Design a protein around this nucleic acid. Structure first.
Ligand SMILES: Nc1ncnc2c1ncn2[C@@H]1O[C@H](COP(=O)(O)OP(=O)(O)OP(=O)(O)O)[C@@H](O)[C@H]1O
Ligand SMILES: Nc1ncnc2c1ncn2[C@@H]1O[C@H](COP(=O)(O)OP(=O)(O)OP(=O)(O)O)[C@@H](O)[C@H]1O
Ligand SMILES: Nc1ncnc2c1ncn2[C@@H]1O[C@H](COP(=O)(O)OP(=O)(O)OP(=O)(O)O)[C@@H](O)[C@H]1O
Ligand SMILES: [Ca+2]
Ligand SMILES: [Ca+2]
Ligand SMILES: [Ca+2]
Ligand SMILES: [Ca+2]
Ligand SMILES: [Ca+2]
Ligand SMILES: [Ca+2]
Lengths: 311, 16, 311, 16, 311, 16
DNA sequence: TCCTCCTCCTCCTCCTCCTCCTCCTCC
DNA sequence: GGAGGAGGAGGAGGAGGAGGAGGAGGA
């Protein structure tokens, strides 16, 4: 796991500074190591002398140098892939939703974005034997569409204590774009204590369409969104959780591309495009991925969560 | 803030 | 190859100073020769008297004067051009990715930037007979999208020991813009020992969009990026490797120009603009080059790396 | 730093 | 031509002093005549007594007094104007690139700055009948973008021995700003022996963006650039060559002004602003000139060098 | 320094 | 089987050398 | 033949850099 920031005091850092760091969001040694010198300067009780000391000491505790692809292929083969509750869909993702990375699921309305997030919020607690993550879930919701009764329906499918599953889902309703980012700083604190295995922001860009209106606020909208997506990438490296954000769509009138622009297209590693099939069937499609080939699968929304096409 | 139950650590979901 | 800095002691330089130089990034006689007098002064245990001695002695070991275009056309005709794994694409580049220079590959998401870097990281190890570089690869990755399983898929195509190919790729994950530059100083050390033939920074400008936010930090962003691109140009001259950086894009709302501004447009010698074709086909295009004509080619991403349009 | 395998010198990739 | 400095010994100067002058950059009587008394004092083995003698004797050998505009209009009408390889472009410059003066070509990337310098480096060897300079070329390159294969392509157009043309281009790669200036002292030596007709520094200000970082080094950056541009102006008067420097651009964020500031705007006599036209066409524009009117022309980059819009 | 060919004097480029 | 319009955003530091000057009294 | 005394008085500015960021179906 990640080393807590308290281990910096044992290396020659004033316990007052650690408190000044922990008031800035940093809670692990990694979070301070990965941080630039610029960020630590922006802290009040920190100067360029301290920041150079903090960065130097923290760098000794976490590897930040070169290795070999062999040593990386080894460490990567032991990465957790959470099942989506669909044999047909996991065969598309070659295992399931991959941890330590940002995954994006966009599509028109009803295409099952929120439904996949509810299934993931349950199956991330199964033992790895059964294809899960053996951890809690963190469901940031910017729409008011978090339904606990949909988590119970999936727990019944996998035979889990519905009362116990709802204890492992830390729910938080974001009301604007500033609050949505504030919830991530509090999120970095919780993941140090417990063991969360899945972070869900649904929808990640819902509140950016309205808080930032026209083109006159376009530049500020993407720069604020870029910091959010960057702060998610930091959580994926600090704790090795799985970040699964959902995205809305927009028509092109010159036939539905996702919003967020190039800021969210480059940041996310895996993009899933969900269409409407027939009846209760849907069609997921590897829109972008570093490793997976471009292909389509057909899942469906059933009364017990996301599952294979029951037909 | 944090809920008095959200601060609680993970629990392996018992079977049923 | 490049002469190691230890050859300065045999010319009247205190072995203590060489240690004070090697603690500043310089590891070859070239790195000290190409360096300005200003940089050596900025070192602590070095004064204007020593620096004038160091520059004078080092200049005797490496040619830094005029020649003729005839002597340069001869020396250039023996330059290595790494194949891209696509006959149609190499015919566009008139040989392949040229060493001793900075090449840039920009485009929207999914356009195969990371995929080309994975193919290059493999084909740079083929013997020159087969169109490679007969050297190791160095893959600095600022996004977390380095997949070793994509290197094995390309090794199977060219019939190479997949276990041996992954031993020749020195991978390093940069977490911010300061760390991204720090990795280049450590990079100059490794290239003295082994024989690297390809340096890859993907993405070179990913972390500059978020570490430096608005326009208020624009000036500092480009000056920090200019030093990075300059430090790459130094590696291309020290060791004659091939620098292949990738770049993100941005929309112009006044229809996708690359980011980085004029700082990265002037610095890079070859720019490749990658579009999305149809299905799995992509369209590369000589955006800028000193010698190559403006033209387009059509490659594709296949299950065995980048290859010709398998259609 | 440097990996114990990154410091190793180049190896001509054997065929397969 | 210019008188060599050896003619000072025949006028009562110690042949030891001439050796002490030639070790300071001066190789012609002009270079010593145009020099201030301050520069000769800064030489070690030279005192105020000698310097007054050196300046007095040298002034007798070269005219440094008043004349008439009639005698100057006569001497100017016999000045050489090198063709740019484009009838449409030469009609803009009213003859071509004018010798005995500093010409600047700035613009965004790909706008054909390096391409014009390659065409000029060839057409400066044509006989004056065909519009050239009947001399060698000197191509100082601070970017690594000197391609001899682009000189051969232009020699084929004008029907010249491609092997002979590459013998008349003295190429030198500058690696920093100190080295860039050092190459000019060695340049003054070569021009005394042979007959160079064109000096090219491309890019003249590329290395000044990175060697001198922020505003804290701004003053030192321009004073170092002012000496360089002044040392070029001296070569244009000593030998009557044609100095053609290229310049990068920078955006103004308050839409692309050239870098270098007022130091390079006043120093250069002719400034050419190169835009991107359509396809392979470009648009040059008299940005500043003492005589030429403000106007635009349209040239293009062809497989045989810079030429008229082949459309 | 100077190349053994850069020190050579100018040559009128012969036709071809 | 066709069709079109929209806008705003700030921050950045470092830089050294310089010379000449004169009159005065008593025991 | 004898016997040293007394400081004054400031000048004089240079030198620009560096772009970002798409949205929105109609009938
Ligand atoms: N318990 C259930 N059993 C079966 N189908 C259900 C159930 N609950 C919801 N659905 C179906 O799933 C779809 C809703 O999907 P979901 O809530 O994921 O939408 P979404 O993609 O998040 O949409 P939006 O952009 O509006 O938020 C609808 O077709 C709905 O009828
Ligand atoms: N093994 C594979 N076989 C076939 N296609 C693949 C494979 N792996 C990835 N792809 C495809 O290649 C593309 C991904 O390209 P790549 O990873 O180079 O993106 P990129 O240009 O780096 O994007 P970004 O800016 O998001 O990082 C997608 O179309 C994906 O479907
Ligand atoms: N042989 C050729 N035939 C046709 N077009 C060419 C040829 N070589 C280069 N070009 C084109 O000329 C342009 C390159 O111009 P050039 O090398 O002068 O750039 P530049 O202005 O010096 O740029 P930078 O600031 O990046 O150095 C590109 O559009 C390139 O496609
Ligand atoms: Ca929803
Ligand atoms: Ca992406
Ligand atoms: Ca990528
Ligand atoms: Ca360029
Ligand atoms: Ca150029
Ligand atoms: Ca001018």
């Amino acid at each position: 796991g990640p080393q807590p920031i308290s281990r910096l005091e044992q290396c020659g850092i004033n316990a007052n500074d650690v408190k000044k760091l922990e008031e800035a969001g940093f809670h692990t040694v990694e979070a301070v190591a990965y941080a630039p010198k610029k960020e630590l300067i922006n802290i009040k009780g920190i100067s360029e002398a301290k920041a150079d000391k903090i960065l130097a000491e923290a760098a000794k505790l976490v590897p930040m140098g070169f290795t070999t692809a062999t040593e990386f292929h080894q460490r990567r083969s032991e990465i957790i892939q959470i099942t989506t509750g669909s044999k047909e869909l996991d065969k598309l993702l070659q295992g399931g939703i991959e941890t330590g990375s940002i995954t994006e699921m966009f599509g028109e309305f009803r295409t099952g974005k929120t439904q996949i997030c509810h299934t993931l919020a349950v199956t991330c607690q199964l033992p790895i034997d059964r294809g899960g993550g053996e951890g809690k879930a963190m469901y940031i919701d910017t729409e008011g569409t978090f339904r606990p009764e949909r988590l119970l329906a999936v727990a019944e499918r996998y035979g889990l204590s519905g009362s116990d599953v709802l204890d492992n889902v830390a729910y938080a309703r974001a009301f604007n774009t500033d609050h949505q980012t504030q919830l991530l700083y509090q999120a970095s604190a919780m993941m140090v204590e417990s063991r969360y295995a899945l972070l869900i922001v649904d929808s990640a860009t819902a509140l950016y369409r309205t808080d930032y209106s026209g083109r006159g606020e376009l530049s500020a909208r993407q720069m604020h969104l870029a910091r959010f997506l960057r702060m998610l990438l930091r959580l994926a490296d600090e704790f090795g959780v799985a970040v699964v954000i959902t995205n809305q769509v927009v028509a092109q009138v010159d036939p539905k591309k996702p919003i967020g622009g190039n800021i969210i297209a480059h940041a996310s590693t895996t993009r899933l495009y969900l269409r409407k099939g027939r009846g209760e069937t849907r069609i997921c499609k590897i829109y972008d991925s570093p490793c997976l080939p471009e292909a389509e699968a057909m899942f469906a929304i059933n009364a017990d969560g996301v599952g294979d096409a029951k037909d | 803030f944090v809920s008095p139950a959200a601060q609680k650590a993970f629990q392996p979901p018992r079977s049923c």
